[PDB]
Design a protein around this ligand. Structure first.
Ligand SMILES: CC(=O)c1cc2cc(c1)C(=O)N[C@H]([C@H](O)CNC1(c3cccc(C(C)C)c3)CC1)Cc1cccc(c1)OCCCCN2
Length: 377
């Protein structure tokens, strides 16, 4: 019955994927950003320059005030508001209605995006990282308790403006090719995984694999970039610089500040390497790898000049909070969040990025010794 949910995500490139939801009685309709890197369901509830509509508690005959304040700070950008509950639906989702916690955003800073077309956020992670504390049941925990929807969901994000699918409660086998490869969820707070090996153009980075997961590695649909721990980032940028030394780039390009442009249709794709992330498998000593093409970590942007040059931002950035496999990483793939079986599945998506001679891939099995030593404590 999942075809009703196929293609239910829209977005403007780099500004997040959203699904359509209704809250309150009568139903008020909002576009909600789908975020696996947080756990709070929150909507705008007061006018804002970048909001074209918002939740009106006054008009919902099912609203209930919880008389507690709340705030969530993200990587950068933050909001505060007032907790409450109300009935919630997903028109292009399962045909159910749940009473769910909602934070009515009343003040915010650098959170809403000009022209993103979404007005709220759906944190799909676990209660442990909910604010103010872990006793505020996140939306998906409420959905699974109060209905018969099974405890998993899958995301198919398609690159560029953009679209995709959120299959709530199951797997749609027509959204991927090949087999699904699963990696354990190490701890139920973020969607935390263990990268066990990293290769660039088939060349192992040869780092202590604890470096890959220092201090964590997570799957985060709410962040554009692939974010790497400092030492892994420096190692990776060195190998990408070397592979593409045929041409010259500003050093501010490697920091994500300056674009790079080529005459339309002449992007030298062949000089940027593929990146392989090996993920811990489901059986002893076993792993699988996902291959990222340059078309995923060179994200397209708007031409600053009056040209039709193709221009790109570098979407690999340095991190101090661990590895983030962001929307950039997820676009090649169908990603199953099998909460019921504590695992995350990857497969090549039906809408996979296309290179002339290379292809994104999910390949296995691989044998990897001592995968347990790769998690950071
Ligand atoms: C580089 C940068 O600055 C940056 C860039 C991007 C997102 C975020 C930060 C961002 O902050 N994205 C948040 C996610 O939740 C982030 N998740 C993490 C996080 C960080 C701090 C605190 C928490 C708690 C609250 C669980 C969680 C775990 C990483 C969710 C989010 C908030 C506001 C707008 C968003 C998206 O759309 C923008 C489109 C995507 C743009 N790309």
């Amino acid at each position: 019955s999942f075809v009703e949910m196929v293609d239910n995500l829209r977005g403007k490139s780099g500004q997040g994927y959203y699904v359509e939801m209704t809250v309150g009685s009568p139903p008020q309709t909002l576009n909600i950003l789908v975020d696996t890197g947080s756990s709070n369901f929150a909507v705008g509830a007061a006018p804002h320059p970048f909001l074209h509509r918002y939740y009106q508690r006054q008009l919902s005959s099912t609203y209930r005030d919880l008389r507690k304040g709340v705030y969530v700070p993200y990587t950068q950008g933050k909001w505060e508001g007032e907790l409450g509950t109300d009935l919630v639906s997903i028109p292009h989702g399962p045909n159910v209605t749940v009473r769910a916690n909602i934070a009515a955003i009343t003040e915010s800073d650098k959170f809403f995006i000009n022209g993103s077309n979404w007005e709220g956020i759906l944190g799909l992670a676990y209660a442990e990282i909910a604010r103010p504390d872990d006793s505020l049941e996140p939306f998906f925990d409420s959905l699974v308790k109060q209905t018969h929807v099974p405890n998993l969901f899958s995301l198919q994000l398609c690159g560029a403006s953009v679209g995709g699918s959120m299959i709530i409660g199951g797997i749609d086998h027509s959204l991927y090719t090949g087999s699904l490869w699963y990696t354990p969820i190490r701890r139920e707070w973020y969607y935390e995984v263990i990268i066990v090996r990293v290769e660039i153009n088939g060349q192992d980075l040869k780092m202590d694999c604890k470096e890959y997961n220092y201090d964590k590695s997570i799957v985060d649909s709410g962040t554009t970039n692939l974010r790497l721990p400092k030492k892994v980032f420096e190692a990776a940028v060195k190998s990408i610089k070397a592979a593409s030394s045929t041409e010259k780039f500003p050093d501010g390009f490697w920091l994500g500040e300056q674009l790079v442009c080529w005459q339309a249709g002449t992007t030298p794709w062949n000089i940027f390497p593929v990146i392989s992330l090996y993920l811990m498998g489901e059986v002893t000593n076993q792993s699988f790898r996902i291959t990222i093409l340059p078309q995923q970590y060179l994200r397209p942007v708007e031409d600053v000049a009056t040209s039709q040059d193709d221009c790109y931002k570098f979407a690999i950035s340095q991190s101090s909070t661990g590895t983030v496999m962001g929307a950039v990483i997820m676009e090649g793939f169908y990603v199953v969040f099998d909460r019921a079986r504590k695992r995350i599945g990857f497969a090549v998506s039906a809408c996979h990025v296309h290179d002339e001679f290379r292809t994104a891939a999910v390949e296995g099995p691989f044998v990897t010794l001592d995968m347990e030593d790769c998690g950071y404590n």
